[PDB]
From Swiss-Prot:
GO terms for cellular component: cell surface; collagen-containing extracellular matrix; cytosol; endosome; extracellular exosome; extracellular matrix; extracellular region; extracellular space. It comes from Homo sapiens (Human). One of its GO terms (biological process) is cell migration. S-nitrosylated in a Cu(2+)-dependent manner. Nitric acid (NO) is released from the nitrosylated cysteines by ascorbate or by some other reducing agent, in a Cu(2+) or Zn(2+) dependent manner. This free nitric oxide is then capable of cleaving the heparan sulfate side chains. N- and O-glycosylated. N-glycosylation is mainly of the complex type containing sialic acid. O-glycosylated with heparan sulfate. The heparan sulfate chains can be cleaved either by the action of heparanase or, degraded by a deaminative process that uses nitric oxide (NO) released from the S-nitrosylated cysteines. This process is triggered by ascorbate, or by some other reducing agent, in a Cu(2+)- or Zn(2+) dependent manner. Cu(2+) ions are provided by ceruloproteins such as APP, PRNP or CP which associate with GCP1 in intracellular compartments or lipid rafts. The chain holds residues 29 to 474 of 558 of the full protein. The gene is GPC1. Glycans are attached at residues 51, 88. It is a lipid-anchor; GPI-anchor. This is Glypican-1.
Length: 347
C-alpha cells in the first residue's frame, strides 16, 4: 500500500530523472492537471508526463496521416501514369503501324498530329480548357471526337486532381496542433492513473473516446465533405467503361489494367471513408480508470464533430471557434466534389 515503487519503475523507463520521485505518497494539492489527492507524482513529474502524453498522441496522429497520405499518393501516381501511358501509347500505336497504311497524307501531317496529341496532353494536365481542323482543312464525325474526348479526359483529370485534393487536405489538416485543454485532458486520461496510485490500470474505452473526440472534433467536421468527395470519386469511375467509356475514348482518338486499378482504388477508398471519425475508436482499441479512480465510466460517448462537443465532460470545447484551416480544406473538398459531379453529369 502507498507504493511509489512501481511508479518509480515506470517513470524511469521514460528516460526521466529517478531523483525526482518520492519514496512515499505526498500531498497532491499542488497538482495542476490530475485531480487533487495523495500522489507519487510531483509537479515536474506531472509536467513531464503531460509532455510525454502529448508527444504520444501527436506521434500517433502523425503516423496515421503519413499512412493515409502515402496510400493516396501511390493511387494518384498510379492512375496519372496509367492515363499518360494510355495516350502516349495511342500515339505510339499511331507511329508504328500508320506510315504506309494512311499513305503519304500521314507522312506530311505527322508533325501536326504530334502537335494534336501534345495539345491533348495539355488538356489532360488542365493547362488549357479551351478547345486543328481549320489548319488541316486549309492545308488539305469530328464533333463526336470533340464530345467523347472531352467526356473522358475531364473525368480522368477530375479523378487524378481529386486524389491530389484529398492528399492536400490530409497533409494540411495534419499540421493543426492540439489545444492546451486537450493536452491536459490527455494527461488526465493516460498518466494520471500512475500518479493517483493505480499505474497498472487501463483507462475506460468511453472515457478515452470522449477525450479523443473532444480533441479531434474539428478534424471530425471534415467527415461529410470527405465522404462526399470519396463518393463522387467512386462515381466518376463508372464513366470509364463501355464503348463510350473513358479508357476506350482515350485509346480511340486516332480512329484490363485500369479495371484492376479501379477495383483496388475502390477498396482503399471504402477503407478510408471512415477516417476522420475513426481515430478515437482506433487509438482506444490499441475495472477501468475513469480519471477519478478505478471504476465504471458514467457518461455516454459524445457524438462526432465540433458542435457535439459543447457538453463534452472530459474536454471543454469552444464551438464558436472553428479551426480556420479545417474549414478551408472543407471548402476545397466541396469545390473538388462539385467539379467531379459536373464532370460526371455532362458539363
Ligand atoms: C509521353 O510522351 C511525351 C514525349 O515527349 C512526354 O510527355 C513523355 O516523355 C512521355 N512519357 C513519359 C511520362 O515519359
Amino acid at each position: 500500500s502507498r507504493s511509489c515503487g512501481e511508479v518509480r519503475q515506470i517513470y524511469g523507463a521514460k528516460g526521466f530523472s529517478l531523483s525526482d520521485v518520492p519514496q512515499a505518497e505526498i500531498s497532491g494539492e499542488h497538482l495542476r492537471i490530475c485531480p487533487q489527492g495523495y500522489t507519487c507524482c510531483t509537479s515536474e513529474m506531472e509536467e513531464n508526463l503531460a509532455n510525454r502524453s502529448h508527444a504520444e498522441l501527436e506521434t500517433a496522429l502523425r503516423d496515421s496521416s503519413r499512412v493515409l497520405q502515402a496510400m493516396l499518393a501511390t493511387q494518384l501516381r498510379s492512375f496519372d501514369d496509367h492515363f499518360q501511358h494510355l495516350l502516349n501509347d495511342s500515339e505510339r500505336t499511331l507511329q508504328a503501324t500508320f506510315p504506309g497504311a494512311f499513305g503519304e497524307l500521314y507522312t506530311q501531317n505527322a508533325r501536326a498530329f504530334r502537335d494534336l496529341y501534345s495539345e491533348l496532353r495539355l488538356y489532360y494536365r488542365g493547362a488549357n480548357l479551351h478547345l486543328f481542323w481549320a489548319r488541316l482543312l486549309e492545308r488539305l464525325a469530328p464533333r463526336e471526337l470533340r464530345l467523347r474526348a472531352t467526356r473522358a479526359f475531364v473525368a480522368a483529370r477530375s479523378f487524378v486532381q481529386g486524389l491530389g485534393v484529398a492528399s492536400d487536405v490530409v497533409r494540411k489538416v495534419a499540421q493543426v496542433p492540439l489545444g492546451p485543454e486537450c493536452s491536459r485532458a490527455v494527461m488526465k486520461l493516460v498518466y494520471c492513473a500512475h500518479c493517483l496510485g493505480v499505474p497498472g490500470a487501463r483507462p475506460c474505452p468511453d472515457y478515452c473516446r470522449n477525450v479523443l473526440k473532444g480533441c479531434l472534433a474539428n478534424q471530425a467536421d471534415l467527415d461529410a465533405e470527405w465522404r462526399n468527395l470519396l463518393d463522387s470519386m467512386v462515381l466518376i469511375t463508372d464513366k470509364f467503361w463501355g464503348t463510350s467509356g473513358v479508357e476506350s475514348v482515350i485509346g480511340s482518338v486516332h480512329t484490363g489494367t485500369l479495371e484492376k486499378l479501379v477495383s483496388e482504388a475502390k477498396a482503399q477508398l471504402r477503407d478510408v471513408q471512415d477516417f476522420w471519425i475513426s481515430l478515437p475508436g482506433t487509438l482506444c482499441s490499441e475495472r477501468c480508470w475513469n480519471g477519478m479512480a478505478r471504476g465504471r465510466y458514467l457518461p455516454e460517448v459524445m457524438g462526432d464533430g465540433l458542435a457535439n462537443q459543447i457538453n463534452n465532460p472530459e474536454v471543454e470545447v469552444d464551438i464558436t471557434k472553428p479551426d480556420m484551416t479545417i474549414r478551408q480544406q472543407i471548402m476545397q473538398l466541396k469545390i473538388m466534389t462539385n467539379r467531379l459531379r459536373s464532370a460526371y453529369n455532362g458539363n
